[PDB]
Symmetry: D2
Subunit: 211 residues, 4 copies
């Protein structure tokens, strides 16, 4: 199956050519960099790029994607990207976008030994336990699973709010604001979970109120 | 500037509608999941999604994006995604894609205190030191910077090869194979660094030869 | 103050000599390695070594020490040591030992920007929030602080129980068992928090029951 | 074997009593905290506590212990402890202490699948590759292994020097200074590897010179 990859280069040239066909300054626009307005934290197993889903222009989104769109406090990968987006790129928005049908969430919920994946998926099991009463009450399994996807987005938003960068910038500037959204591969629609950003911040501030 | 975000939802519906216009089974195709053939490790500050650059179909790529497309051995985020892609998704290809003009590489090369970012960017400085003689010899700064982008891709490919998952699968199956590519925002072209995958594996195997 | 360190070597020779004086086979015993019976997870700012506090013999304890004796699921340092102690050393006991007066806990509770320390100490603030009602009810600050030290030990014990290694070994072998203890620098006494190990395991098993 | 642990509490009381017997203000001294003068980074599988080996007083050493005494740049555990020791405790010395016979180093050198341990031990294999020519030249295996222990200490010292905290403090204050030592369980002696601290710093500064 040696040919399959050499094909990726032909499809790349084709895409470049039509994009110039669609717009002559396409790669001229691309080159002069205005900072992204968004930090997007999404899932590695979601199937459509944020830029497609949202209609955002190239360079408008700075993108982190990981299994189940997690924001873990001892994960330097994501922590350093939040820090960098807020403090140095001066992003106006941070979105955590989950998606229904998420493979990572489903795999988190399977009681098996997944090696290296175990401590990663553990975070999702932690989300479940944080809402155990509500989740267990939901009879249908798929409905429960979708609710878990949603609560995970909410909890990862809470974890973004805990960051010093976010709080300092918000105090000083009133930005970035945080959004929790969920994409639905069935109808292609983005849904806003209407994450109550101000109240999350107030709850976290009870023991961590900075200037 | 309260309106700007509510606009993202209108652009989402517009994108969904035209995609159905372009193809009626678009969201029907999207729903029935064939595993991705690729794991793509790219940079958070690259501006065009892999799916665009390569012409790959939605769901064909499982995507991780982080600052400067790093594969760090104590980063559970990326390690768990490599493990998951190789062992459970049975990905046929792993691509590390860097890009010229990379902000993360450039910031790594600035001698300043960037807080949380410091130990992340340190990895890139480690790449420089690994090729210090070659890099220092390059007089022009931008040329040096582009070469660093390239060597970083090569070194992160080496780090993918060190993984037990990769070696075991390759021994048993002959896949995944690893690619190191670099995107160029100036002309939109993907370039293959022609990473010599077999020899990297042999060098690493001198002290870590598994079955 | 150049001399102060060269003194450490004289004190080392003195300690070696008296230990031979105290016992001639001291370094002969030391050399033939029986696996540790304990994994000890303690705090970097505790002042007396576990081996002293407990009367354990050298080599009896495999020791991890970090700020505030945390067991974080995305911390490969501690996760790999739990995995290694349980699976390869076949440790019979895992102890999480906190200590009153803990500087890390106190610093977690100070609302300031501590740079790199912020996401580490965040874990402790997470413990507080998990028991917010109980903790806030405690009027006296020091009493609250001691209670937090205790609850942190309990929560880090819960995090050890979530590990696949621990559960598998316990199912198969009935070991290791987990202990949560707290050292008190004021009277030198170890206190058992009497962590109910079996019930923690049952609660965690509601969504993660392995074989 | 239910009794074995309840014994640890009797040995604790015995130790407390004799320590008061040895010195009446022992626990009074312990309570009033002068900051540690040392940050000690040692190995989890070393058998004698630093405080014993060195003759240091309780509270004089702030201690981190992990498998093979590694200082990994994406390990928040150790990075946050270096940051905290240098910036907030104002430690005068940082010691990385390895030890001959190290189980972690030996296990790193075994070509097998150790699960979660793999990416941790990979760091040690990286040290080997950095000195591959020198190490491979050493015919005797044990001699090679001891040399690897030594080079690992040297490389982890280099990694401490890369930290912003260390460089800033050293520039401003002339402290902390960094030491690389190795303990020998056979004779109980500490050996100084005489890590050339100033030159390491100069080499690292070629691309990372801060103020
Ligand atoms: Zn997903
Ligand atoms: Zn980049
Ligand atoms: Zn402490
Ligand atoms: Zn060791």
């Amino acid at each position: 199956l040696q040919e399959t990859h050499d094909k990726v280069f032909e499809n790349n040239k084709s895409w470049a050519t039509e994009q110039v066909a669609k717009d002559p300054d396409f790669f001229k626009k691309l080159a002069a960099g205005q900072n992204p307005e968004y930090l997007w934290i999404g899932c590695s197993d979601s199937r459509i790029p944020a830029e497609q889903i949202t209609g955002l222009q190239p360079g408008d989104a700075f993108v982190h994607r990981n299994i189940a769109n997690l924001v873990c406090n001892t994960d330097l990968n994501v922590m350093s990207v939040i820090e960098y987006a807020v403090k140095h790129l001066k992003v106006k928005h941070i979105v955590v976008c989950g998606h229904y049908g998420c493979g990572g969430v489903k795999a988190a919920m399977t009681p098996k030994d997944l090696g290296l994946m175990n401590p990663w998926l553990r975070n999702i099991r932690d989300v479940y336990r944080l809402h155990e009463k509500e989740l267990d009450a939901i009879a249908d399994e798929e409905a429960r699973y979708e609710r878990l996807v949603e609560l995970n987005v909410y909890e990862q938003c809470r974890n973004v709010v805990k960051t010093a960068a976010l709080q300092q910038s918000y105090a000083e500037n009133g930005f970035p604001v945080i959004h929790g959204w969920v994409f639905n591969f069935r109808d292609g629609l983005l849904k806003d979970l209407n994450v109550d950003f101000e109240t999350i911040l107030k709850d976290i501030q009870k023991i961590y109120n900075l200037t």
